[PDB]
Assembly symmetry: none
Homo-oligomer: 127 residues x 4
């Protein structure tokens, strides 16, 4: 196999480029990565999808991991902080851990894409 | 009759994480106390008698991405209300929302008729 | 009567000087006045007390108005913003209005001292 | 046996405006999701077996003014737990609280034995 960076995608160029929004914006920095999530989302199934480069079967550089509800809306993202030095593997694992932990606080159920697996009361209806 | 909102928008079910309500005259004001630091846009559907809001059917408060975070509407089983109730309810909602550092803008129709 | 400033008090020097705290801090500025309140307080009776100067039966300058729960804890305050020009009567009336409105959002019941009258689900028990 | 908390502190009833819970092993983690931007101090009462936390009775999270905003404690009807459950519950609580921009400090006893 080649030891050089190879680009892996879960997301199309629309999905990774999409402007998305948080009803209740929260964020956490870990190393060179920024984690953002919408604290309003609850009781949903959430799918993690990522675009990233690998070296030999292992994620090296994350471009973006985004969290999707079944309707295809984006509710969270892990992305590099531009002013920081490139992130470590520890940063990625930590970032995914806190994203999952954050989302499960609200009884969301998380699943990760195959690429990720391989290479890396609460509300009241008005009336 | 003025319609800032589509049928889908006024009919949409919506939820509050921290539900709070105030009643004024025949109007109920519901707002999600959990919402903070958002630009909020007020849109309303209501009748106009000559040149002033007469009967309010619904005023809903929207984030830039279209999430509903509050509503003023008649109490279903006791809907009778006045233009005064409406003015009061709006002041109440705007004050509630601004306490959580949200910024409010009203539709052109609301500014004009209310 | 004298037309010159006269000092009226609802609060002792301990009460007006007390450092106090907000579990959920909120604030609103109106003119030359700052209004702070603890958004966590609910379903309580709240008493407004103020120290201020009057000219002839009318409040002129507010030093501090503080909101007290029956146990004597402070849960809100209206006070002058030091960097601003002295506030107007309109500011005081507006500040009291938003304090009361803010507190009643949480089903608190407000009463005001005699001096003020004269001169001026929601939570779940763990388990 | 270590006691960061007094009898009053551990026995105090407390409430959440936005209640959230996670269970890990025999431990329940409850936290008020509405609390933000606070310095939070963790205090715990627990047994020590030689030189490590053995059994957790209660860990509670306090604001500077002594308000309780979260708790780790055994599920009353199924309290059996391990030192591992405790380490997990603490990571969970700290993460939950930090998501809302709270800053965490742990008692000297917690740092030492946990």
């Amino acid at each position: 196999s080649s030891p050089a960076p190879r680009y892996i995608t879960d997301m199309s160029i629309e999905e990774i480029s999409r402007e998305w929004y948080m009803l209740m914006p929260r964020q956490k920095i870990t190393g060179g990565l920024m984690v953002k999530m919408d604290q309003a989302i609850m009781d949903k199934r959430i799918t993690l999808k990522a675009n990233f480069s690998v070296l030999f079967d292992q994620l090296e550089t994350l471009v973006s991991l985004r969290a999707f509800t079944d309707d295809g809306a984006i509710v969270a993202e892990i992305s590099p902080i531009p002013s920081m030095p490139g992130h470590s593997t520890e940063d990625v694992k930590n970032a995914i851990g806190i994203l999952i932990g954050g989302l499960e606080w609200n009884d969301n159920s998380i699943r990760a894409s195959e690429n990720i697996q391989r290479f890396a009361q609460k509300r009241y209806m008005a009336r």
